[PDB]
Amino acid sequence: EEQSFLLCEDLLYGRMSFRGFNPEVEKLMLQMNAKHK
Amino acid sequence: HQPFSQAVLSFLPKMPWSITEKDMKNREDLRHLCICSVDPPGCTDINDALHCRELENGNLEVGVHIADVSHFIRPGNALDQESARRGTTVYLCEKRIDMVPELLSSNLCSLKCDVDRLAFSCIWEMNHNAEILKTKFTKSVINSKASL
Amino acid sequence: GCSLRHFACEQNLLSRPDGSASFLQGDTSVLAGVYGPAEVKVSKEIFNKATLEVILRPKIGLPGVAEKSRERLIRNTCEAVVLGTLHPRTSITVVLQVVSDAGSLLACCLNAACMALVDAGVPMRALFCGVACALDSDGTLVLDPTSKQEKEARAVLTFALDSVERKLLMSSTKGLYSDTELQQCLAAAQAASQHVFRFYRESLQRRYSK
Amino acid sequence: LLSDQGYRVDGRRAGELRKIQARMGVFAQADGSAYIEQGNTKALAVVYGPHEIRGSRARALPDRALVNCQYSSATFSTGERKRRPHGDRKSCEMGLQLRQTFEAAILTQLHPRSQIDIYVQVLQADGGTYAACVNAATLAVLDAGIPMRDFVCACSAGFVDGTALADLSHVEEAAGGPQLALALLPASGQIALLEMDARLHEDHLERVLEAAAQAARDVHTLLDRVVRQHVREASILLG
Amino acid sequence: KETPLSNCERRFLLRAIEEKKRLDGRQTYDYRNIRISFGTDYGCCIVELGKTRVLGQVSCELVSPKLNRATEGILFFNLELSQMAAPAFEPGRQSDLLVKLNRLMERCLRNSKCIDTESLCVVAGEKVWQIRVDLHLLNHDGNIIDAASIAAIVALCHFRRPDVSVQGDEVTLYTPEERDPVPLSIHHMPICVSFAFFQQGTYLLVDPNEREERVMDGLLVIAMNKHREICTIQSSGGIMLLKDQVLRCSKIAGVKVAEITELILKALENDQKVRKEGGKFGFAESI
Amino acid sequence: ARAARTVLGQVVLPGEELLLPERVRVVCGPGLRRCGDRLLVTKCGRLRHKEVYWVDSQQKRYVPVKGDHVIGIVTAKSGDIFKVDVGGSEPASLSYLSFEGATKRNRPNVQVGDLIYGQFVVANKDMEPEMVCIDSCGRANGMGVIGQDGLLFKVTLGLIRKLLAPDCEIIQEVGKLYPLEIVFGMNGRIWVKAKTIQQTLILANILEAC
Amino acid sequence: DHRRIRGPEESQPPQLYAADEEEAPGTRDPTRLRPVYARAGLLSQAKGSAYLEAGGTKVLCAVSGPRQALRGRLLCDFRRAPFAGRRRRAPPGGCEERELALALQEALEPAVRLGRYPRAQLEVSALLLEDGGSALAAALTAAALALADAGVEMYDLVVGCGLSLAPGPAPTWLLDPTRLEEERAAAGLTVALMPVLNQVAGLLGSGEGGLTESWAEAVRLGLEGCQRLYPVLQQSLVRAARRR
RNA sequence: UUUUUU
């Protein structure tokens, strides 16, 4: 009855970074990972 | 000297072809006979075919055998229209311009070696002094032995 | 003995449109590009249903009156099958460019439009396909005629059929037939629709390999 | 026969122009008005200046001005009567190239939300129409005082028998084949617009381009006099 | 209703231009990998300049001639932007780009004297061939000029017209079944090459695609020949350029017209060798 | 015992009816709709199930769905609200007081033509959608203006649904090779940034080329 | 051009190839009116309609209703039917139809008061089925009756009559001619006046030859004709109102 | 400018 797609299967995170390239980005990714786990 | 039109190519028999006996109703088979053809070197088409054989009673059986173009070209057709327009085959120094398309005159009526083809034949019962008593006209299928 | 000629179908050729379907039927060829749900002008604002535009263009000459009638037939078939109540105040544009005209344009056009509406992702209730029969002077019918069979015959019928229960969706006519001939052409069209609807499922499995 | 013993059909050599006379300020009802003639080609240009957008208000750009150019030929120009409605294709192009050349150097930066219209009407075409229209529009703009980068001059050139020709007539555009018109602003030498419809070979190209630019510079050395003469006989009446 | 370009798109793409690197990875002087395909019947071609498809069709009829020109045939061009090509190409909205392409194609392939008009006249003043070509833009991701010129030249090369025989005053045409259709008389193959100028003529580029046309401010078209003759040139976009730039541009355009003429000749030879042995559509080199 | 839930890893055709066994009702995904006691299929795709049934299709046009992370582009501003292009049917709205720590005294710095990362709060068929850049508690978890100097491009939604699984392949290799940072957006949009331009181009090609 | 079914390239009428000498219709009384059959409200899907018949002249009119200082603007479209008259005109027309439409628009605005219609428009559509005679005047009269039955506010009706001049040695004005009496004619005139306010609403008449006195006599004779013609239109609109 | 093979 809902056309969603994030709360159907499973998504990943918000604004995923890599190679500690940026900064605040790593922490946000870690928080997303914590939410996932 | 224009190349052949597309509707005329449709009226040829199909290119994978062998001898079909169902069209040989009035025809007689003479594969056992030896028949050779002599030709000025380097032809694609050939139409002459001969044999001579001694009979038991001192007589001779002489056969002139001709390729049957008429078994393939029905009247009123567009291939008949092309052959009625051109009429004869024009020969030049470098190349020639055939009246019949190259498929038919190259393979399906040129009496190649050691293959059977349709033919229209005349048989003479001629003596050792070569005068003729009886003459026969027939449709046949002919397997030539050699080209010379 | 009634069977179609050779089918070929290709998806996702063009980059810019939302869907792309090339459909090769024998020698004829129709390419269809469909824009998805997009913005409308204010004049076509319909609050219940979605506007569904169809543009049909042949390759020689500029398009005329008969092509306008054909594209109205396309818009009515599609809005019969496109579940358009789900998307209000949006416009779906279906564009058809005739690549090769070898006979029975409307069948190949409807097949290309159906594949293009599938691949673009517009929600529909059912599939649909188009076939054609040709009635000669004697009465022997031919499914999917060539241009020469279309030219010689006394009747040409084109039917667009549905996928759920094989019902008649669209019908166009150039001929002088009787009703029993109509019934026989409809039955042969249902058999041909069975073959084409299997051909849809085979190509849609051929896409999703990865 | 076009050029034999160095002389052309008109009786002029390969470098010199036609006689061109430009008059400013014809229509006092409008804002800027110019009338120019190059030989027998008559051109008339009217510009209504930076007025606000009257209708269809979504067309306005927020930063720069908008330039609208419309080319209309008279119906009695050549021998055969031609009709400007239902004959729009040639004209639509001739307007859009004028739009290009006058969005090139008109300084749209100083006039936000502003519409500048340039209307050019040709009264008698005798070859070299495009250059005459651009020159008429330049004189018309410099009537109305829209501040622009540079004086704009355009001319044409051809290539016959190994020699370059400047400022072609209708005869020389008819039989010849190589036409090359250009619009030029001479303070920096920057070619503002190129047009060429020919079968011209590459090894000659630079030569005729130089001659084309040279003809343009001659136009800039003539019309300038007219403008200064005009503005001089303004100031004597003022102060 | 088209999607607008980002500011960051503009800034990143201009910074990419300032170090001589494209988006896809080619150099500044490289056309995309082209592909020529043919239709079933004569004169139907599909040109892919690389995610940009142009359809080309040649039709031909018998029309009474124009009165001033009694002894040659009329060419009539139509380049129509299809609806599927770009979402902003609604009919009647894009008049400017339509006229700007149409007149350029018409001037090139008419006033270049590319294909003969004098070979067409059947009966002077009464019957003459009339050739109409139609180009449809199917997918818009680059130069419509270059792909349109390629498609028009390939369609003029591939087209065949039915024979007519003139005997006294009898004009007897034939069906394509009754006679072989003869090919058309062509002098040479002129072609168009598009150049993109960025930030007032500092940086020269060849063959911009969609983003690369949205960020640019100058376009130039040079039409050249096999024998290295320049047919037509046209500037657009409101830029100012020195003559040294077009003098160096003609040379690169000559190299490119030589390569694409090689590609078109390989295309025609491969299609003809396909149709000699059973009949099909002849793909063509995509390099 | 056919066409209820047996084909749970196959490719369905749009329109083939399937039903659920048996009160305990289930929830339908994006492709399926309800009809009495059966489920109507509207798209092509492969059916997947998790305990909900859902089908996925590689389609380009995004439909506005409530609560998704979407990169949008500022169109213009009109007073308090400013409009954003999403790539959908109608452009969405933003209020300047919806950003983190903003009132009438402090305007958030939003310029015309800058990309914005946020999420839709209201998105249905009835009205135009509206998005925000704040969490439910009242803070920004990386939302707002992305900034400049990073290449934006557009991909298929199926690629995003493949890459943002917890089981992925390309993202870990890309993070292993060298430094960079990227932003995904559920309408099919990817923003990238590396230290140099060449690595940014190689990243863009490797991301879009599969 | 391509929105209609094309046919032959060029066609000719048969009457020019017809070999016959058609006689003049002879002599008549000058003030001999044609019998008038008018009825209003004939159509259903239009807001107001009128049908007017006079001898061999037929005309129909219908009015689309109002749709969205400021002043109303009635723009009127005048199409002739393609099979009215000997020669067949093109279905767009384009030359003569806009010329008659300006006569309609400049004759109807003194009738319809437009201060009561801010930012609205009215579409008056007239259609001429059979060109038996005075073509402009019957269109004016039927458009006036259709606007009256449509329910827009007016000051008066519009009654129009056409005139014509026989080209004999003594030029004598004729009133309400037939098509043959226009084909023989030299000069034809058409007036229309609101009979209650007694003011001319529009006069359009092409000339061949005349003098200033003769045009004055023709104008006052046309005024007498329209004033004479009025009560049949009155009783017809009364009966059409009694149907309501 | 017959005549037989091309």
Swiss-Prot record, chain A:
It is found in: Nucleus, Nucleolus; Cytoplasm. It comes from the Eukaryota. Phosphorylated in M (mitotic) phase. Disulfide bonds: none annotated. There is a cross-link at residue 27 (Glycyl lysine isopeptide (Lys-Gly) (interchain with G-Cter in SUMO2)). Associates with the RNA exosome complex, mediated by EXOSC3. Interacts with ARHGAP18. Interacts with exosome cofactors EXOSC10 and MTREX. RNA-binding protein that associates with the RNA exosome complex. Involved in the 3'-processing of the 7S pre-RNA to the mature 5.8S rRNA and play a role in recruiting the RNA exosome complex to pre-rRNA; this function may include C1D. Belongs to the MPP6 family. This is M-phase phosphoprotein 6. It comes from Homo sapiens (Human). The gene is MPHOSPH6. The chain holds residues 60 to 96 of 160 of the full protein.
Swiss-Prot record, chain B:
It is found in: Cytoplasm; Nucleus, Nucleolus; Nucleus, Nucleoplasm; Nucleus. Widely expressed. Transmembrane segments: none annotated. Component of the RNA exosome complex; within the complex interacts with EXOSC4, EXOSC7 and EXOSC9 of the exosome core complex (Exo-9). The catalytically inactive RNA exosome core complex (Exo-9) associates with the catalytic subunit EXOSC10/RRP6. Exo-9 may associate with DIS3 to form the nucleolar exosome complex, or DIS3L to form the cytoplasmic exosome complex. Exo-9 is formed by a hexameric base ring consisting of the heterodimers EXOSC4-EXOSC9, EXOSC5-EXOSC8 and EXOSC6-EXOSC7, and a cap ring consisting of EXOSC1, EXOSC2 and EXOSC3; DIS3 associates with the base ring of Exo-9. Putative catalytic component of the RNA exosome complex which has 3'->5' exoribonuclease activity and participates in a multitude of cellular RNA processing and degradation events. In the nucleus, the RNA exosome complex is involved in proper maturation of stable RNA species such as rRNA, snRNA and snoRNA, in the elimination of RNA processing by-products and non-coding 'pervasive' transcripts, such as antisense RNA species and promoter-upstream transcripts (PROMPTs), and of mRNAs with processing defects, thereby limiting or excluding their export to the cytoplasm. The gene is DIS3.
Curated annotation (Swiss-Prot), chain C:
GO terms for cellular component: cytoplasm; cytoplasmic exosome (RNase complex); cytosol; euchromatin; exosome (RNase complex); nuclear exosome (RNase complex); nucleolar exosome (RNase complex); nucleolus. InterPro entries: ExoRNase_PH_dom1, ExoRNase_PH_dom2, ExoRNase_PH_dom2_sf, PNPase/RNase_PH_dom_sf, Ribosomal_Su5_D2-typ_SF, RNase_PH. Changing residue 90 to I: In CABAC; decreased interaction with EXOSC3, EXOSC9 and EXOSC10, when assayed in a heterologous system. It comes from the Eukaryota. GO terms for molecular function: 3'-5'-RNA exonuclease activity; DNA binding; RNA binding. Changing residue 182 to H: In CABAC; strongly decreased interaction with EXOSC3, EXOSC9 and EXOSC10, when assayed in a heterologous system. Highly expressed in a variety of hematopoietic and epithelial tumor cell lines, but not in normal hematopoietic tissues or other normal tissue, with the exception of testis. Its main location: nucleus. One of its GO terms (biological process) is defense response to virus. Belongs to the RNase PH family. Homodimer. Component of the RNA exosome core complex (Exo-9), composed of EXOSC1, EXOSC2, EXOSC3, EXOSC4, EXOSC5, EXOSC6, EXOSC7, EXOSC8 and EXOSC9; within the complex interacts with EXOSC3, EXOSC8, and EXOSC9. The catalytically inactive RNA exosome core complex (Exo-9) associates with the catalytic subunit EXOSC10/RRP6. Exo-9 may associate with DIS3 to form the nucleolar exosome complex, or DIS3L to form the cytoplasmic exosome complex.
Swiss-Prot record, chain G:
Its main location: cytoplasm. One of its GO terms (molecular function) is RNA binding. GO terms for cellular component: cytoplasmic exosome (RNase complex); cytosol; exosome (RNase complex); nuclear exosome (RNase complex); nucleolar exosome (RNase complex); nucleolus; nucleoplasm; nucleus. The keyword Phosphoprotein does not apply. GO terms for biological process: DNA deamination; isotype switching; nuclear mRNA surveillance; poly(A)-dependent snoRNA 3'-end processing; positive regulation of isotype switching; RNA catabolic process; RNA processing; rRNA catabolic process. Keywords: Cytoplasm, Exosome, Nucleus, RNA-binding, rRNA processing. Signal peptide: none annotated. Residues 1-33 are annotated as: Disordered. The keyword Hydrolase does not apply. It is found in: Cytoplasm; Nucleus, Nucleolus; Nucleus. SUPFAM superfamilies: Ribonuclease PH domain 2-like, Ribosomal protein S5 domain 2-like. Pfam families: RNase_PH. PANTHER family: EXOSOME COMPLEX COMPONENT (PTHR11953), EXOSOME COMPLEX COMPONENT MTR3 (PTHR11953:SF2). Non-catalytic component of the RNA exosome complex which has 3'->5' exoribonuclease activity and participates in a multitude of cellular RNA processing and degradation events. In the nucleus, the RNA exosome complex is involved in proper maturation of stable RNA species such as rRNA, snRNA and snoRNA, in the elimination of RNA processing by-products and non-coding 'pervasive' transcripts, such as antisense RNA species and promoter-upstream transcripts (PROMPTs), and of mRNAs with processing defects, thereby limiting or excluding their export to the cytoplasm. It comes from Homo sapiens (Human).
